[PDB]
């Protein structure tokens, strides 16, 4: 019952999308918190050798100037889905002359995701976090290989998803500021990280309504972690 | 046994095991209660949240100004069927310039979902749809089970632990016709609460209501918008 | 086991179906190309030498591709036929498009590109036929090219395929001659190796086929030797062999 | 087959001409060979004859004299006995035989 | 079935049994019955005229039979008046009668765990899920 | 039983067919590539001459474009096809966009070409992982590594083939800024990197170097021999 | 043969089975007789599945209550590095952490040893999942 | 002797297509048999009309079908596939007449039909139609001809033939008849067919139990004799 | 080899395409047919022995023409032979339409074998389980070719497939001399089927096609009866 | 076993097992009957309501193929709806191509060919429903046709489909449908369908009837309510 995306288990489950979801646990922890001030996005680098360029590891990519992205799982599937997101939001801007809402970009990415056995392949073994600011305000959206897209005030994907999520429920609350959200996310990441936290072990990215520029953290990661 | 791997094969007892398994996908989703009066068609859905601090999933979808659904099954199949409905409704409004009657939409859904259950290359649509609509022939409530079989339901509830709602609806079946908006919505809320476990109770975040009426289009009430129907609900006996 | 399809990768990373096609060339016929300057040859063998076989082609194992290209064949008959048809078609396409003969390697590259495609796309059995190529061009002159059912090729100075391929290549290496490889010496070496790699002795002329390519007045005449010249060649080898017994 | 259990792994290849002639001479020592029977020629008529097949050839050469009530075996008695013991089964089908060029 | 091994003692028992079934003729008040879950391994000599004969056929209960069977084994338990035994039968397939009683037993046990007196339909559903050792997890990809 | 298909996920979310594709490169010859300040040198080991075949048709380092070159591993049959496809693609990109391809763009194209082969049933993945290194970036040298799965990564230096673990581990300890400060030192870095050959013969090492706005220059077996001798003389300091 | 002897012993046991409570444990429940597994002899069937993360931390804490560990150990972190791990392999990881802390003469088993113990108990025998083929997950 | 069988495209080790073999054993599933015999100037076909109820519309139970005004056929096999073969043959005959300008000879008719059935045997797309076609018709310059052509695609001319459960017995009885040569007139041909079916079935043949089709050179038109005519023929057979 | 004999696109560990061999075994279990090449022409003979007297012996012909100068014979699946003869006729007509000269035997056999190879390269299509003997009179020298389901076309001087084919070849190489003529080629061909045909040689049981200077033509039963009375 | 999984495989006996399985799936459906009157045809179908929550007149099993053609499916209802759809498409195509209402014989033959076409490929399955077609025309009389899942289609004077096939055949054969005008054969159909469906099993049930003939002027529309009430009352009077 688990050899295809076309077979249903006797208890009713598609025992192929579940396996794709299990592939997320084989990624790296990614933490995102949505606040009124903005949305943060922290990710473990998990570099394998010092020789590889840190910029080569694309864990936080940019769908557009107004929404960030976080990945966990397959690099190839995620890059395929990301090329969909950038192209889709650019097409939406071209046709409607406006910035796409993060919910709509997540909808398009999911619409691509709902095609593993819904055409006429395999589910994309990657979970996607979409953080950005829109008309309704700052918003964080998370989607899974099944294409189920939902918004989360603060969500953690990849490895340590259960532990990071559980430790995030206790610390997070609605009236949170961006600096405190960054500090809390870094604290959770350091707690759930296998290696000691430093500048090169993580990348950070924040999205604010008024500073839709600077969708990264270059060399000032050292300042933030040193105040932990 | 061995005849439960493909829809194309027939079991010795004259059953198709894949659809019987597809039937089970509906019960995986949360319970959703749909009931119609002589003047309104309202379906109430139990929304679930994957985590404490994650927003509850949308259970009631918008198909047209006079047809709306609640989904109980697979999310991907639900989205695909909703997109198919929206495209069909737009085409009908474009070509006949008339709000397409809900029965024809349900028949088209049956025709489309009957395709996977006869040709290999696609799995059955593992989603259950409570189709609520208002055409010129009065309010309606349909349920499209994944077996491509649809029934004209006066009131129905599918999903996880949805049976306790069905026995409540069948018990208050007679009085559903001569009900106004608020009383019918309260009956639906009572059924949905019957689906809930003893510890859980309907709060403003886990319940969603969508109503289509004589002069009212299909409108989604969530968060604060469900509260006007949530207030006045009688507390569950305990 | 992981040899059900040609597109299945073994846990060790080995394409089992491909190697099954590779090792199956041991059942193919013996065709070899000897080292030679100002010329080059292939020496094929006729397994089916039954008397009731009427001979009409005289080149059942030797095929001419271009006006300056010739190739042997070793594999399944139908695969060899379709492969040589594609060979001639590609060579003529290049001749039409560039108004210049195919420069040897690009034709072999074309076949290997076609052949590997069967080893990557599903539903197609890999071409189980390996084939030598000879030819001349204005780039590198006489060349000898080794096709391999995996789509892998390689330049060579002396090689053989088919039955007793290892013995033939080892014997060719035993007397391997670089530079001093005149056409007469190449023919003598071909007959000398065919005497041993073929189980049947005395090397009957009708059971041995030699095809030679030489540059004559800028024409690249491709020759298949008739029964008389093969007879005198095996006679020369026999007379040479008689002298070798004077050691005792 | 790992060493420490099997130190030497001795191969027994089919005998060569100078070896098959030896087999022909040890299995015909008790045989009343005539004059002019070149045992090397019979050995030359058996390419790759296993080694037991040489003894079979000797036995059948003697048998060809038993059915004639004699005690001596001639060269023709061996040459006509080589084709009997050293018989071969062909494919007997050109369609299968030309599967491979 | 038949097969000097150590089974030559039960063989005499079986043959003596066969002798007594064939010894007594019908029309007397010595009607015999025998039960077994595997007739595949039964010696057909036992299933011959004059011996047992008239093989009664016991099938796996169908949906209505499953609902009825689940109804009988809950009469002694304070089951709630609103339990759709028919729906229970729909959700119970490939289930023998022993499991159709174990579902009621497990439903009562789960009701005791929940600290309730009457057994709701959800208790019966959890009994169905637990009689086959399955654990019900709310999968996130359905919604 | 989760490894006889490419589009079947293992219970733990593994594409075992994809993983088995990375076994082909581990069986191929060792290829090393390090990026220098002005000379990006890539080298290959284990030439494994058959002593009867001309080495021209054996070439493993090929230039995809005028300013980019790539050395592969794994099986050559798929390597030739990816060679031709990359060459056609870079020429086509030069046609549609006047600016010639950059190293990252050609690496992305190769990765996407491999991924579209690993994405569907009935199509076996390219069983190679190529080292994309070139100076087409117009000022900043870059070197990349593709994977048979379809993932491309940028390294300051890499090592692929049979011996990737050992060469990579030894390369970290001696890859620093002072080593790459000189072009000759940069090529000597390749020299000692491939010096850990299977047999360490020293005559089976083929190194190619490309410089800023220059042409590809495969080292002749007299400059390569001279550099090997120079490295040995530098290594003679241990005595 | 003698196989039917233990067969008849099992049949007699089933006869005895069908205030007495009976316990049975097995790691291969598919080899048992269906008659013995029917809910007239075994009315309940409890499945001991692989523990979740929260249970894996609990097992780690139980097996490390007597160990001489440093009071900073992130057992929650260690649980996530043992996916699909039985309760016995966690005990082996705890034992091997002290093994590593004994190999080098340290009387306190720090967190670094526990990661090393995991890399050799779990990762060294879970699967291959090597670095050259693990550059696809990130 | 199950063999490989399960796929029609797979040859057995001995070289017999087992799946195509089972089509013939599917032919006689209907429990009916049809007998064709060629006279000196006519061809007649007699089939079994076993209506196992009083509610069936006896008009539509016919196993005889009219493909063209000059050629008729009788069906032995599964009813659905027999009707499908009838529909295909009607289209084939119409296409022949429209393409070449004259009516199709009976031989070419299920030469084409057996050609269609043969492609179904090779390509693993269509399950072979489990039914035989027995065709009669007056073609000029050769008189009446009868053709029986099977799912396997083998067609031949028969002086008389029969397919069904009682096929071997019927063909044996014809073997007995066509040998003692006599004047095969129309009444003699009908008598021979009636005797065939009666002897193989040992049935008195109530007039509602059979359907006989006649094609004669005098009137080259497919005709199904009504109940009274077959009653008269049965009476003439009686005396 | 044991489990890989099913698929025709899967090599065995010894690299044997077992399905083609099974198709050839199906060829070897067919009706024996013989063709021999004389210095005057080519003669092909086959036994069309029906299972009963009930059959019309003149209905279906085994020895069949393609062009005016080429004839075919087979030993195997007759339904498969019909599609083969149809495609061979189409290919010959296509060559005639383009080159305006009649198809040479070598080329026609090459393209027929290529048609045979088309059905032995993908799953779902079965090899043409018939072997074909093809004659030809062209450029003043007779031809006799055999094409098998494997697509390997030979240049048989004289051969015989079908049942007891080994004994048929054993008869040849004994009474077959290269310098014979057509008239005794008929007698040799009739003799060859005599060692395998179980029964009396009646004029509607052995069909012979001479492929002479004038062209290939299937012998009418009267001439076959004349030759058969001559030999007997 | 082994010869049963695919509909393109023939058993060693020589039968398509998938087809027989589809047929034995139809017997797991509520009984539907049809008796053809002297000047028309009448259908009586039993609709077992599965729950009180279904609205009256839901998932109906009487379909209108065309203006004069009628449909009385029995089996799994999804394939029944699809078969109704393809039959309506065929009828519309025939009307648009030939200019007149499609004859019942031709429509039944074409629908049988469509049904039979799905019992030949391994990629599809035989339909799980068996249905009766009926129509009346002054130029063709009245016809009734069964098209079973295998694809066979021959006329029935009176037929039944569902669980109680033989049980309804026995009570149909004792009627003279040749003569009695089906003004009262609707009444007799209600009677007969009330004999079948023992009340102990299947619980509640609901009965739908439709007719074709001179009475309805060629059409097939459902019988008016007033006649249906009296027909049901007359059916209930046969309790003894």
Task: Tell me the HSE value of B108 on the side-chain side, using a 13 A CA sphere.
Answer: 17
| Number of other CB atoms surrounding residue H223 within 10 Å | 14
Q: Could you give the dihedral angle defined by the CA atoms of residues F53, F54, F60 and F63, in that order, rounded to the nearest 10 degrees? A: -160
CB I156 within 8 A of CB C51: no
Chains G and J touch (3+ CB pairs under 8 A): no
Distance separating alpha carbons of residues C118 and F99, to the nearest angstrom: 36
Sheet holding A39-44, edge to edge: A154-157, A30-34, A39-44, A202-207
**Residues of B in Cβ contact (< 8 Å) with J123:** 8, 119-121
User: What CATH number has the domain spanning F1-239?
Assistant: 3.60.20.10
Chains F and G touch (3+ CB pairs under 8 A): yes
Q: Contact E140/A18, CB-based, under 8 Å?
A: no
List all chains that touch chain J, counting a touch as 3 or more CB pairs closer than 8 Å.
Answer: B, H
CB H67 within 8 A of CB H86: yes
Distance separating alpha carbons of residues J220 and C46, to the nearest angstrom: 80
Query: Which token pair is B77?
Result: 């199949």
Distance separating alpha carbons of residues B153 and J54, to the nearest angstrom: 4
Distance separating alpha carbons of residues F17 and C7, to the nearest angstrom: 10
Residues whose CB falls within 8 Å of the CB of residue F209, separated by 6 or more in sequence, listed in order:
F39, F40, F41, F42, F183, F187, F217, F219
Chain B, 106 to 125: residues with Cβ < 8 Å from chain A are 120-124
- DSSP SS3 for B36: strand
For the purposes of burial, counting CB atoms within 10 Å of the CB of B189, is it exposed (0-12), middle (13-18) or buried (19 or more)?
buried
Domain that holds residue I43: 2-231
Query: ∠ CA A132-A137-A143 to the nearest 5 degrees?
Result: 45
Q: Does A166 touch chain B (CB under 8 A)?
A: no
For residue C64, give the CATH number of its domain. Answer: 3.60.20.10
Q: Give B77-92 as a DSSP string.
A: HHHHHHHHHHHHHHHH
Query: ∠ CA H55-H57-H63 to the nearest 5 degrees?
Result: 125
CB H143 within 8 A of CB H217: yes
Nearest to H130 among J14, J155, J173 (CB): J14
Total domains, chain B: 1
Q: What kind of experiment solved this structure?
A: cryo-EM
* Radius of gyration for the alpha carbons in chain D, expressed in angstroms and rounded: 18
- Phi, psi (5° rounding) for residue J104? -60, -40
Residue matched to tokens 């299937």: I218
**Residues of D in Cβ contact (< 8 Å) with I24:** 93, 95-96
Distance separating alpha carbons of residues B19 and G50, to the nearest angstrom: 31
**Residues of H in Cβ contact (< 8 Å) with J143:** 57
Nearest CA among H168, H156, H232 for reference residue H194? H232
Nearest CA among J110, J150, J113 for reference residue J22? J150
Distance separating alpha carbons of residues A27 and G134, to the nearest angstrom: 10
- DSSP SS3 for F182: coil
Nearest CA among I168, I145, I189 for reference residue I30? I168
Nearest CA among H179, H174, H182 for reference residue H200? H174
Residue J137 pairs in a beta bridge with: J141
Query: Which token pair is I135?
Result: 């004659």
- Classify residue F199 by its DSSP letter: S
- DSSP SS3 for B128: strand
> Using H for helix, E for strand and C for coil, what is the string for chain I?
CCCCCCCCCCCCCCCCCHHHHHHHHHHHCCCCEEEEECCCCEEEEEECCCCCCCEECCCCCCCEEEECCEEEEEEECHHHHHHHHHHHHHHHHHHHHHHCCCCCHHHHHHHHHHHHHHCCCCCCCCCCCEEEEEEEEECCEEEEEEECCCCCECCECEEEECCCHHHHHHHCCCCCCCCCCHHHHHHHHHHHHHCCCCCCCCCCCEEEEEECCCCEEECCHHHHHHHHHHHC
Distance separating alpha carbons of residues C160 and C157, to the nearest angstrom: 10
Residue C92 Cα to chain centre, angstroms? 21
Distance separating alpha carbons of residues G89 and C118, to the nearest angstrom: 47
Distance separating alpha carbons of residues A108 and A104, to the nearest angstrom: 6
Distance (Å) from the alpha carbon of G55 to chain A's nearest alpha carbon:
12
Nearest to I6 among H4, H16, H145 (CB): H4
Q: Contact I11/C24, CB-based, under 8 Å?
A: yes
Query: Which token pair is I35?
Result: 């063709």
CB D28 within 8 A of CB D57: no
Q: Does E135 touch chain A (CB under 8 A)?
A: no
Task: Spell out the domains of chain J, with CATH numbers in brackets.
Answer: 1-238 (3.60.20.10)
CB F132 within 8 A of CB F146: yes
3-state helix, strand, coil split of chain E in percent (to 5) is: 45, 5, 55
Q: How far is CA H191 from CA F230, H194, H239, in A?
A: 110, 5, 11
Pairing state between β J206-213 and I158-161: unpaired
**Residues of B in Cβ contact (< 8 Å) with J54:** 151-154
Distance separating alpha carbons of residues B186 and B189, to the nearest angstrom: 5
Angle between helices C77-98 and C105-118 (to 10 degrees): 130
| Number of other CB atoms surrounding residue I149 within 10 Å | 32
Chain C, 133 to 192: residues with Cβ < 8 Å from chain D are none
Q: Contact B170/J24, CB-based, under 8 Å?
A: no
Q: How far is CA B228 from CA B209, B215, B236, D101, in A?
A: 11, 19, 18, 87
Q: Contact E98/G5, CB-based, under 8 Å?
A: no
Pairing state between β H33-38 and H42-48: antiparallel
Q: Give D57-72 as a DSSP string.
A: HHHHHHHHHHTTT-SE
Q: Contact E143/B160, CB-based, under 8 Å?
A: no
Query: Which token pair is G38?
Result: 């029917």
Distance separating alpha carbons of residues C24 and I15, to the nearest angstrom: 5
CB B158 within 8 A of CB B31: yes
Nearest to G136 among A28, A74, A193 (CB): A74
Distance separating alpha carbons of residues B194 and J122, to the nearest angstrom: 46
For residue B70, give the CATH number of its domain. Answer: 3.60.20.10
Q: How far is CA C72 from CA D26, H71, I35, in A?
A: 48, 57, 30
- Phi, psi (5° rounding) for residue G111? -65, -35
Nearest CA among J209, J228, J230 for reference residue J220? J209
Domain that holds residue B224: 1-234
Residue A56 Cα to chain centre, angstroms? 17
Q: Return the residue of B nearest to A9 by Cα.
A: B21
Domain that holds residue C143: 1-246
- Phi, psi (5° rounding) for residue F166? -65, -45
Nearest to J57 among B147, B152, B155 (CB): B152
Residues whose CB falls within 8 Å of the CB of residue I82, separated by 6 or more in sequence, listed in order:
H111, H114, H115, H118, H153
Q: To which H or E segment does residue A69 belong?
A: strand A67-73
Q: To which H or E segment does residue B24 belong?
A: helix B17-28
For residue H58, give the CATH number of its domain. Answer: 3.60.20.10
Distance separating alpha carbons of residues H180 and H176, to the nearest angstrom: 8
- Phi, psi (5° rounding) for residue H105? -60, 145
CB J209 within 8 A of CB J223: yes
| Number of other CB atoms surrounding residue B8 within 10 Å | 23
CB H48 within 8 A of CB I40: no
- DSSP SS3 for C20: helix
Q: Return the residue of I nearest to C48 by Cα.
A: I154
Angle between helices B163-171 and B181-195 (to 10 degrees): 140
Task: Count B/J contacts: CB-CB distance under 8 Å.
Answer: 99
Distance separating alpha carbons of residues J28 and B225, to the nearest angstrom: 47
Nearest CA among F143, F106, F149, F185 for reference residue F31? F143
Q: Could you give the dihedral angle defined by the CA atoms of residues C178, C181, C185 and C187, in that order, rounded to the nearest 10 degrees? A: 100
Total domains, chain I: 1
**Residues of I in Cβ contact (< 8 Å) with H154:** 78-79
Residue J32 pairs in a beta bridge with: J45, J161
Distance separating alpha carbons of residues H38 and H215, to the nearest angstrom: 10
Task: Count H/I contacts: CB-CB distance under 8 Å.
Answer: 103
Residue matched to tokens 């693609």: F89
Distance separating alpha carbons of residues I132 and I146, to the nearest angstrom: 5
Q: How far is CA I29 from CA B82, H149, I26, I166, I192, in A?
A: 61, 22, 5, 12, 17
Task: Count C/D contacts: CB-CB distance under 8 Å.
Answer: 27
Q: Return the residue of I nearest to D91 by Cα.
A: I166
- DSSP SS3 for E11: helix
Query: ∠ CA I213-I215-I216 to the nearest 5 degrees?
Result: 125
Give me the helices (H) in chain A, please. Answer: 17-22, 75-96, 102-113, 161-171, 178-192, 221-226
Q: Return the residue of A nearest to B54 by Cα.
A: A152
Query: ∠ CA H60-H61-H65 to the nearest 5 degrees?
Result: 75
Distance (Å) from the alpha carbon of A94 to chain G's nearest alpha carbon:
32
Total domains, chain C: 1
Distance separating alpha carbons of residues I85 and I73, to the nearest angstrom: 10
Domain that holds residue H104: 1-239
Q: How far is CA A222 from CA A95, A200, C186, in A?
A: 42, 9, 74
- Count the helices and strands in chain B (H runs, E runs): 6, 10
For residue I98, give the CATH number of its domain. Answer: 3.60.20.10
For the purposes of burial, counting CB atoms within 10 Å of the CB of F191, is it exposed (0-12), middle (13-18) or buried (19 or more)?
buried
Total domains, chain H: 1
Nearest CA among C73, C67, C133, C75 for reference residue C106? C133
- Phi, psi (5° rounding) for residue I211? -130, 80
Q: Contact G128/F19, CB-based, under 8 Å?
A: yes
Q: Return the residue of A nearest to G77 by Cα.
A: A192
Nearest to B27 among A12, A118, A169 (CB): A12
């Amino acid at each position: 019952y688990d050899r295809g995306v076309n077979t249903f288990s006797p208890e009713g489950r598609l025992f192929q999308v579940e396996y794709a979801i299990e592939a997320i646990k084989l990624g790296s922890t990614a933490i995102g918190i949505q606040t009124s001030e903005g949305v943060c996005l922290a990710v473990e680098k998990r570099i394998t050798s010092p020789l590889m360029e840190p910029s080569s590891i694309e864990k936080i990519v940019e769908i557009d100037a107004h929404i960030g992205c976080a990945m966990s799982g397959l690099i190839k599937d995620a890059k395929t889905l990301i090329d969909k997101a950038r192209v889709e939001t650019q097409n939406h801007w071209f046709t409607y002359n406006e910035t796409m809402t993060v919910e709509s970009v997540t909808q398009a990415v999911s619409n691509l995701a709902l095609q593993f056995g819904e055409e006429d392949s395999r589910p994309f073994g990657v979970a996607l976090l979409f953080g950005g600011v829109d008309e309704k305000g700052p918003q964080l959206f998370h989607m899974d290989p099944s294409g189920t897209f939902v918004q989360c005030d603060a969500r953690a994907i990849g490895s340590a998803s259960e532990g990071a999520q559980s430790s995030l429920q206790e610390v997070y609350h609605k009236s949170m500021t961006l600096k405190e959200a960054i500090k809390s996310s870094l604290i959770i990441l350091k707690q759930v990280m296998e290696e000691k936290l430093n500048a090169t072990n993580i990348e950070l990215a924040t999205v604010q309504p008024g500073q839709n520029f600077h969708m990264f953290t270059k060399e000032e990661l050292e300042e933030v972690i040193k105040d932990i | 046994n061995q005849y439960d791997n493909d829809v194309t094969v027939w079991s010795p007892q004259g059953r198709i095991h894949q659809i019987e398994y597809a039937m089970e996908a509906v019960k995986q989703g949360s319970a959703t209660v749909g009931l119609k009066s002589k003047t309104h068609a309202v379906l109430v859905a139990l929304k679930r949240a994957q985590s404490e601090l994650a927003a509850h999933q949308k259970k009631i979808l918008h198909v047209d100004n006079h047809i709306g659904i609640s989904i109980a099954g697979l999310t991907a199949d639900a989205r695909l069927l909703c997109n198919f409905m929206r495209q069909e409704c737009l085409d009908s409004r474009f070509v006949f310039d008339r709000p397409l009657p809900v029965s024809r939409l349900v028949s088209l859904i049956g025709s489309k979902t009957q395709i996977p259950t006869q040709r290999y290359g696609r799995r059955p649509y593992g989603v259950g749809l409570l189709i609520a609509g208002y055409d010129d022939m009065g309010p309606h409530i349909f349920q499209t089970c994944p077996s491509a079989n649809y029934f004209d339901c006066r009131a129905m509830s599918i999903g996880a632990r949805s049976q306790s709602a069905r026995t409540y609806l069948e018990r208050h079946m007679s009085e559903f016709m001569e009900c106004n908006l608020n009383e019918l919505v309260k009956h639906g809320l009572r059924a949905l609460r019957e689906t809930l476990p003893a510890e859980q109770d309907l709060t403003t975040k886990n319940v969603s209501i969508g109503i289509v009426g004589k002069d009212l289009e299909f409108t989604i009430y969530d968060d604060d918008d469900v509260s006007p129907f949530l207030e006045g609900l009688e507390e569950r006996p305990q | 086991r992981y040899d059900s399809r040609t597109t299945i990768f073994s846990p060790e990373g080995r394409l089992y179906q491909v190697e099954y096609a590779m090792e199956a060339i041991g059942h193919a016929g013996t065709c070899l190309g000897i080292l030679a300057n100002d010329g080059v040859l292939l020496a094929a063998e006729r397994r089916n030498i039954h008397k009731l076989l009427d001979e009409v082609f005289f080149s059942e194992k030797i095929y001419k591709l271009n006006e300056d290209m010739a190739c042997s064949v070793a594999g399944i008959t139908s695969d060899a036929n379709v492969l040589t048809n594609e060979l001639r078609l590609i060579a003529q396409r290049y001749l039409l498009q560039y108004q210049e003969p195919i420069p040897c390697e690009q034709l072999v590259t074309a076949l290997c590109d076609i052949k590997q495609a069967y080893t990557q796309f599903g539903g197609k059995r890999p071409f189980g036929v390996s084939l030598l190529y000879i030819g001349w061009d204005k780039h590198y002159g006489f060349q000898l090219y080794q096709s391999d059912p995996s789509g892998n090729y390689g330049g060579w100075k002396a090689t053989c395929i088919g039955n007793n391929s290892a013995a033939a290549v080892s014997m060719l290496k035993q007397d391997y001659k670089e530079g001093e490889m005149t056409l007469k010496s190449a023919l003598a070496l071909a007959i000398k190796v065919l005497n041993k790699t073929m189980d049947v002795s005395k090397l009957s002329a009708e059971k041995v086929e030699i095809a030679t390519l030489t540059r004559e007045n800028g024409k690249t005449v491709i020759r298949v030797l008739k029964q008389k010249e093969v007879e005198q060649l095996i006679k020369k080898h026999e007379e040479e062999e008689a002298k070798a017994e004077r050691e005792k | 087959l790992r060493p420490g259990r099997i130190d030497r792994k001795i191969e027994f290849p089919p005998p060569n001409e100078e070896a098959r002639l030896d087999i022909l001479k040890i299995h015909s020592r008790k045989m009343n060979l005539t004059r002019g029977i070149n045992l090397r020629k019979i050995a030359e008529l058996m390419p790759g004859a296993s080694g037991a097949e040489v003894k079979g050839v000797c036995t059948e050469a003697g048998m060809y004299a038993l059915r004639e009530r004699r005690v001596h075996v001639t060269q023709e008695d061996f040459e006509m006995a080589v084709a009997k013991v050293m018989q071969k089964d062909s494919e007997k089908n050109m369609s299968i035989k030309k599967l491979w060029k | 079935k038949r097969f000097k091994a150590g089974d030559r003692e039960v063989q005499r028992t079986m043959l003596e049994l066969l002798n007594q079934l064939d010894g007594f003729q019908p029309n007397t008040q010595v009607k015999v019955i025998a039960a077994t879950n595997r007739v595949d391994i039964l010696d057909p000599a036992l299933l011959r005229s004059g011996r047992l004969d008239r093989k009664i056929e016991f099938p796996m209960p169908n949906e209505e039979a499953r609902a009825r069977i689940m109804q009988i084994h809950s009469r002694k338990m304070n089951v709630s008046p609103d339990v759709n035994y028919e729906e229970l039968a729909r959700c119970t397939d490939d289930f023998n009668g022993a499991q159709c009683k174990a579902v009621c037993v497990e439903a009562g046990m789960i009701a005791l765990r929940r600290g309730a007196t009457e057994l709701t339909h959800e208790d019966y559903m959890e009994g169905i899920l637990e009689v086959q050792a399955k654990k019900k997890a709310n999968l996130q990809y359905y919604a | 039983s989760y490894d006889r298909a490419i589009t079947v996920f293992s219970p733990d979310g593994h594409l075992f067919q994809v993983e088995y594709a990375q076994e082909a490169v581990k069986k191929g010859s060792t290829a090393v590539g390090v990026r220098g300040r002005d000379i990006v040198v890539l080298g290959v080991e284990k030439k494994s001459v058959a002593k009867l075949q001309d080495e021209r048709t054996v070439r493993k380092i090929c230039a995809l474009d005028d300013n980019v070159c790539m050395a592969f591993a794994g099986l050559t049959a798929d390597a030739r096809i990816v060679i031709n496809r990359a060459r056609v693609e870079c020429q086509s990109h030069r046609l549609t966009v006047e600016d010639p391809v950059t190293v990252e763009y050609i690496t992305r194209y190769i990765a996407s070409l491999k991924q579209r082969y690993t994405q569907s049933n009935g199509r076996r993945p390219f069983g190679i992982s190529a080292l994309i290194v070139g100076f087409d970036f117009d000022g900043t040298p870059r070197l990349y590594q593709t994977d048979p799965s379809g993932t491309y990564h940028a390294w300051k230096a890499n090592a692929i083939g049979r011996g990737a673990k050992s060469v990579r581990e030894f390369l970290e300890k001696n890859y620093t800024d002072e080593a790459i400060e000189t072009d000759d030192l940069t090529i000597k870095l390749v020299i000692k990197a491939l010096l850990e050959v299977v047999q360490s013969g020293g005559k089976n090492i083929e190194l190619a170097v490309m410089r800023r706005d220059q042409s590809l220059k495969i080292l002749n077996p007299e400059e390569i021999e001279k550099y090997v001798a120079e490295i040995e003389k530098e290594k003679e300091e241990n005595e | 043969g003698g196989d039917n002897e233990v067969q008849r012993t099992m049949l007699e046991l089933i006869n005895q089975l069908d205030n007495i409570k009976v316990l049975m444990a097995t790691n291969r429940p598919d080899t048992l007789d269906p008659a013995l597994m029917r809910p007239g002899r075994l009315d309940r069937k409890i499945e001991f599945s692989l523990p979740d993360l929260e249970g894996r931390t609990h097992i780690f804490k139980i097996h490390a209550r007597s160990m001489s560990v440093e009071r900073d150990i992130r057992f929650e972190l260690l649980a996530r590095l043992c996916p699909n791990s039985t309760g016995a392999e966690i005990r082996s990881v705890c034992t091997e952490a002290g093994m590593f802390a004994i190999r080098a003469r340290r009387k306190i088993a720090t967190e670094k040893d526990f990661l090393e113990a995991v890399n050799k108990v779990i990762k060294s025998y879970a699967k291959f999942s090597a670095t050259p083929r693990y550059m696809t997950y990130n | 002797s199950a063999g490989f069988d399960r796929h029609i495209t797979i040859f057995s080790p001995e070289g017999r297509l087992y799946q195509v073999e089972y089509a013939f054993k599917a032919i006689n599933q209907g429990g009916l048999t049809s007998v064709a015999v060629r006279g000196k100037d006519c061809a007649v076909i007699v089939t079994q009309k076993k209506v196992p109820d009083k509610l069936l519309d006896s008009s539509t139970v016919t196993h005889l079908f009219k493909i063209t005004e000059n050629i008729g056929c009788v069906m032995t096999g599964m009813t659905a596939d027999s009707r499908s073969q009838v529909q295909r043959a009607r289209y084939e005959a119409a296409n022949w007449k429209y393409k070449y300008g004259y009516e199709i000879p009976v031989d070419m008719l299920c030469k084409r039909i057996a050609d269609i059935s043969q492609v179904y045997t090779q390509n693993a797309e269509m399950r072979p139609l489990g039914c035989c076609m027995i065709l009669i018709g007056i073609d000029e310059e050769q008189g009446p001809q009868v053709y029986k052509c099977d799912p396997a695609g083998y067609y031949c001319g028969f002086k008389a033939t029969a397919a069904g459960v009682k096929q071997t017995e019927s063909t044996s009885f014809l073997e007995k008849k066509v040998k003692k040569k006599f004047d095969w007139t129309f009444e003699q041909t009908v008598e021979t067919a009636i005797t065939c079916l009666s002897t193989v079935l040992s049935i008195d043949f109530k007039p509602s139990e059979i359907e006989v089709g006649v094609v004669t050179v005098e009137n080259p038109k497919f005709r199904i004799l009504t109940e009274a005519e077959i009653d008269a023929h049965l009476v003439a057979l009686a005396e | 080899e044991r489990g890989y004999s099913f698929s025709l696109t899967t090599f065995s560990p010894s690299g044997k395409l077992v399905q083609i061999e099974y198709a050839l075994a199906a060829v070897a279990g067919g009706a024996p047919s013989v063709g021999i090449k004389a210095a005057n022409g080519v003669v092909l003979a086959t036994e069309k022995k029906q299972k009963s007297i009930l059959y019309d012996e003149r209905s279906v012909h085994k020895v069949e023409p393609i062009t005016k100068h080429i004839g075919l014979v087979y030993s195997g699946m007759g339904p498969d032979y019909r599609v083969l003869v149809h495609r061979a006729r189409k290919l010959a007509q296509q060559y005639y339409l383009v080159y305006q000269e009649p198809i040479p035997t070598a080329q026609l056999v090459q393209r027929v074998a290529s048609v045979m190879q088309e059905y032995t390269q993908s799953g779902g299509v079965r090899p043409f389980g018939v072997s074909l003997l093809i004659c030809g009179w062209n450029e003043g020298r007779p031809y006799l070719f055999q094409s098998d389901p494997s697509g390997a076309y030979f240049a048989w001087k004289a051969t015989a497939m079908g049942k007891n084919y080994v004994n048929g070849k054993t008869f040849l190489e004994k009474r077959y001399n290269e310098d014979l003529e057509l008239e005794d080629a008929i007698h040799t061909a009739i003799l060859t089927l005599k060692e395998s045909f179980e029964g009396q040689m009646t004029e509607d049981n052995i069909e012979v096609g001479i492929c002479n200077e004038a062209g290939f033509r299937r012998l009418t039963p009267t001439e076959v009866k004349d030759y058969l009375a001559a030999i007997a | 076993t082994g010869y049963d999984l695919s509909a393109s495989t023939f058993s060693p006996d020589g039968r398509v097992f998938q087809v027989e399985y589809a047929m034995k799936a139809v017997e797991n459906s509520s009984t539907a009957i049809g008796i053809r009157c002297k000047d028309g045809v009448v259908f009586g179908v039993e609709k077992l309501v599965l729950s009180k929550l279904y609205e009256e007149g839901s998932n109906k099993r009487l379909f209108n193929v065309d203006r004069h053609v009628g449909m009385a499916v029995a089996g799994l209802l999804a394939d029944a709806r699809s078969l109704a759809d393809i039959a309506r498409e065929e009828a519309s195509n025939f009307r648009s191509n030939f200019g007149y209402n499609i004859p019942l014989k031709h429509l039944a033959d074409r629908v049988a060919m469509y049904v039979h076409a799905y019992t030949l490929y391994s990629a599809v399955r035989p339909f799980g429903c068996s249905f009766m077609l009926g129509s009346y025309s002054v130029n063709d009389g009245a016809q009734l046709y069964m098209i079973d899942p295998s694809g066979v289609s021959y006329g029935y004077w009176g037929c039944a489909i569902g669980k109680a096939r033989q049980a309804a055949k026995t009570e149909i054969e004792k009627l003279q449908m040749k003569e009695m005008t089906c003004r009262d054969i609707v009444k007799e159909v209600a009677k007969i369908i009330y004999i079948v469906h023992d009340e102990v099993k299947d619980k509640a049930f609901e009965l739908e009837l439709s007719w074709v003939g001179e009475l309805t002027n060629g059409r097939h529309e459902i019988v008016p309510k007033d006649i249906r009430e009296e027909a049901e009352k007359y059916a209930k009077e046969s309790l003894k």
